[PDB]
Amino acid sequence: EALYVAGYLALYSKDEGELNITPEIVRSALPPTSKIPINIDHRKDCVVGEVIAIIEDIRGPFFLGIVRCPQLHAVLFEAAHSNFFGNRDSVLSPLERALYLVTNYLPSVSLSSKRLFTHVALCVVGRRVGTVVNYDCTPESSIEPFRVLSMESKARLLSLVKDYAGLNKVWKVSEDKLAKVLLSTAVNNMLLRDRWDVVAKRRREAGIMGH
Amino acid sequence: EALYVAGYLALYSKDEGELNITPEIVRSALPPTSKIPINIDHRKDCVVGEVIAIIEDIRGPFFLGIVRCPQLHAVLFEAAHSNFFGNRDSVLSPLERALYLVTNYLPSVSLSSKRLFTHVALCVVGRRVGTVVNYDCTPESSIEPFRVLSMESKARLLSLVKDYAGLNKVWKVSEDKLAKVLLSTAVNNMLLRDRWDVVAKRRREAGIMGH
Known part of the structure; x- marks a missing residue:
């Protein structure tokens, strides 16, 4: 059971x-x-x-x-x-x-x-402006909600994915250190304000209008 | 090196x-x-x-x-x-x-x-209304910022503290589980909005006006 994440690395x-x-x-x-x-x-x-x-x-x-x-x-x-x-x-x-x-x-x-x-x-909010992401359980669903992304583009990714062999590879990290990296993103973000408002607008900028 | 925490358990x-x-x-x-x-x-x-x-x-x-x-x-x-x-x-x-x-x-x-x-x-925000707390490195400093707390009251605590023997006792928990309890307060609070605004007003309610 994997998760597919899709989003813009950066807006020009x-x-x-x-x-x-x-x-x-x-x-x-x-x-x-x-x-x-x-x-x-x-x-x-x-x-x-x-x-x-x-x-x-x-x-x-x-x-x-x-x-x-x-x-x-x-x-x-x-x-x-x-x-x-x-x-x-x-x-x-x-x-x-x-x-x-x-x-x-x-x-x-x-x-x-x-x-x-x-x-x-992966993090709470990034330095860049459209860096909010979508996660789902099928490649075509991670990208399904970006209202601006062309069907021509959506199409292209979906194919590249079909090539991609290794969609089995399970990345193993260790709970003990995983709980520390995940605790580290909290500590180093506790002071940020309008957290969900920031993520609200980065979302709108990416075209994740979905609703 | 200890920390003293002082605050109201609840406002009547x-x-x-x-x-x-x-x-x-x-x-x-x-x-x-x-x-x-x-x-x-x-x-x-x-x-x-x-x-x-x-x-x-x-x-x-x-x-x-x-x-x-x-x-x-x-x-x-x-x-x-x-x-x-x-x-x-x-x-x-x-x-x-x-x-x-x-x-x-x-x-x-x-x-x-x-x-x-x-x-x-100890947690991000509590169910109660004046539950914000102050931490410092001396009993008289934890309580020093509550602008409403009577000097008569501040006094009383400070004395009770003087009795208190065991101010050496060092509580040992284990990094591995500590990082999990501390990660757990983040996960279980990620959705809360106006986090610092909530803590802003609980602070004002406790009398921690300090500034």
């Missing part, structure tokens, strides 16, 4: 100086030579999946990745209180409960560009 | 139904027979100090407690990024850096009343 111009990503960079950068990994908090020792594809959208780089780490769901599930999820969920959610936890805890993605890329980080 | 009436604490309860309840403990997240397996005294204020029960757990500072310090605290802190903070972390991560206190009491929990 909008993200601002330094952080700014541009076409001369994108096009040069892809197709990326080294299979780009997805870790949490930029922790090299805490990788939990891998970007299976990145294209270049009229608006910016758009990616799809796979997060298949059995431990990532176990430690979170443990963390949630006996009543996160009512009985209205008992009678309906299975692994969608993992997905519910991971989406709200780690809503954004951070592209640690090397220049071109290195690794994609 | 204001906290609302059920949760509501009242004089017939307070006066009966104190002096508490069993030395009341302070744990995190209501985790019986995660106690990190003990309430050294509770009095009855015109406004409500006011307490003082000691949090002397070497592990509690170690795991947090580890969690903070290499740059939580600039160099402007290098040249000034020592254990006040522990205090800075613990105050912002665990700002409120929850009195799991049995009827009368059981244990005091």
